[PDB]
Design a protein around this ligand. Structure first.
Ligand SMILES: [Zn+2]
Ligand SMILES: [Zn+2]
Ligand SMILES: [Zn+2]
Ligand SMILES: [Zn+2]
Lengths: 215, 185, 185, 215
């Protein structure tokens, strides 16, 4: 399908509209721009950080993957984190989850999808680790809960990386945030895990899970 | 869902696919990593590719690099930045692989060339994944693209790497390498 | 080739499968990594498992931990050793997962228990790989085992985790965890 | 098949034979034993480092994988290397390849084997990178050449890890070796890549490839 010739023209048009409306827009942006935020979010299509954040363009370093994971031994995301933290000196990392997430839904289904199964086993381990809380919930309320739990677990993993622990240890400023977005209701205000230290991580995480385990 | 494109780009901050392609909301299924890599053994990127192809039946995968890429500059620099260097080794391999062509070059043009070559190499890798191949093998419609966004002017540039089959992957991959290695402007 | 076992053990130096099992030469197809892990997303270990199962049709996979495992001690210690800590986080998860049982324990017994639990968890992971499951699904003969070699006396100890099907994996995994969490000696 | 009850009895028997023949054998071994070598070798079954090296027991830290790879972004092997080098202070790493290797043979075939395909693409990239040298060789001599090349490439990768480069930089003693074993002829004496530094790596590697590109 010839969606491609259309995509290019739209780029062209957009780039023209930006120049004519601000001549030095690309000059300003192309140069010496240092992001102060990292966004770890889902590859799903209605959860773009460009859409969800109000940040100045060039402020956001971005990684996206299926179900917004920080797997302890994932070279890809750990590299984004380490480059962001050690080299770019970013001081805030955001893990953003969302409702109606395909990854969460696929983690919860038993379809053999090959490779993606291996990746989602991490989510399934998280589902089993909160089996009680989820089991005593209504089948179709569960995806929403798992999403919320997942963010909290991934932030926990983030805060336990060698990279984050060291930064904190040597007194570099670094705060982690875990939010959850809903397509209709927007950002669920009762979510926010938030950490600036290992001690704060623990409290924020624990509290977050307790809060979620309310009836 | 039904987005129509998987966009594989760099994590670098000026280069938002949504903004840049200016499409309807929800068109883009997205992966971003440092220097837009597709690495044969990276569950992360591959899982995105597989979700895209087998679950969402996306028909277009775009790999888009960009000018002025910090990843590429780090890949070119002999300087220890830590864990990230091992990730960039794949690109540094590519640097040295085409070291004769890049050697010829005026040093301030080398980052632009390595950016271009890197896109073509990553598409060559995408195209060799079991994921992409099986989809071709069994008749699914699937095209791969390799472009470069220029941060100085907002413009996507085709690199003329495009594949709809294993055979056409070979053809255009070779062509692009030859084109870049031999020709001059 | 035709070895009959895949042995997945630790890289630690006293614990050579060949020496210890005292088998005919060429019986063992082998993977070793730090703390004998099977990680859902580790191409390295998984590729070994797949070669074993699909190419060589090996019928027995052994996961063998051992007493006195440096990996396990590092996993238990709150101390930054670098890159390796991220690898050991998987085990540290397990430590904290069974933290109540291990909490009860006399501190010089905790490494032995975590060693045991770790074997059972890793088998639970092996057993959940698409590789193992498809082989079961389609009728191939395949059994998984979880033992611990005791470096103090040279003796393999069964941990009673054994699976020949997804269903029997559940059964013995649960049993072993219950057995270890509840009972006392 | 009941190979398992047999395996246990053989362990038992072996352990008894060792005690009765040396009472304090296991005491001596179980304790405070620090390896001075790391062996990276193939999972294939007739290439055990216990068999191939004459080292004292407890001297060898061991990793084995399909086709003895050091992939730049492989968390598993990089962890073995980093633990060996930074924590255990090992001063020699050996990458051992071998002839009649299944990995090499599978890399060279076009069977879809699923996951293992992804892993072997690394080898296939190495096959293509020496396409000339291999192509002008006789089809059934090629596996043997690819094995030999592979060792040299993996040692090259090893020596370019952040881990090895740093060790060298801060002046820690560390030497890398690449050997190739043949089931009949034994260790091919013309192989030995050997490096104690980045400068030596380069020379040894380059020379090794040139040497191999002789007619
Ligand atoms: Zn999602
Ligand atoms: Zn970039
Ligand atoms: Zn161990
Ligand atoms: Zn082999």
């Amino acid at each position: 399908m010839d969606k491609i010739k259309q995509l290019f023209a739209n780029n062209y048009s957009w780039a023209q509209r930006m120049k004519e409306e601000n001549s030095t827009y690309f000059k300003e942006l192309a140069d010496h721009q240092t992001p102060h935020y990292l966004w770890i979010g889902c590859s799903d299509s209605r959860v773009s950080p460009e859409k969800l954040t109000n940040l100045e363009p060039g402020e956001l370093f971005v990684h996206r993957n299926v179900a917004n994971q920080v797997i302890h031994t994932d070279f890809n995301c750990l590299s984004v984190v380490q480059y962001a933290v050690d080299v770019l000196k970013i001081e805030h990392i955001i893990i953003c989850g969302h409702t109606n997430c395909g990854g969460i839904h696929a983690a919860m289904a038993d379809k053999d999808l090959g490779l993606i199964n291996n990746w989602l086993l991490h989510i399934r381990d998280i589902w089993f680790k909160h089996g009680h809380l989820l089991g005593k919930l209504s089948p179709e309320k569960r995806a929403d809960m798992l999403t919320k739990i997942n963010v909290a677990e991934q932030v926990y993993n983030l805060g336990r990386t060698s990279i984050v622990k060291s930064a904190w240890e040597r007194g570099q400023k670094l705060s982690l945030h875990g939010w959850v977005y809903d397509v209709n209701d927007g950002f669920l205000v009762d979510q926010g895990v938030m950490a600036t230290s290992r001690e704060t991580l623990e409290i924020s995480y624990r509290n977050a899970i307790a809060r979620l385990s309310i009836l």
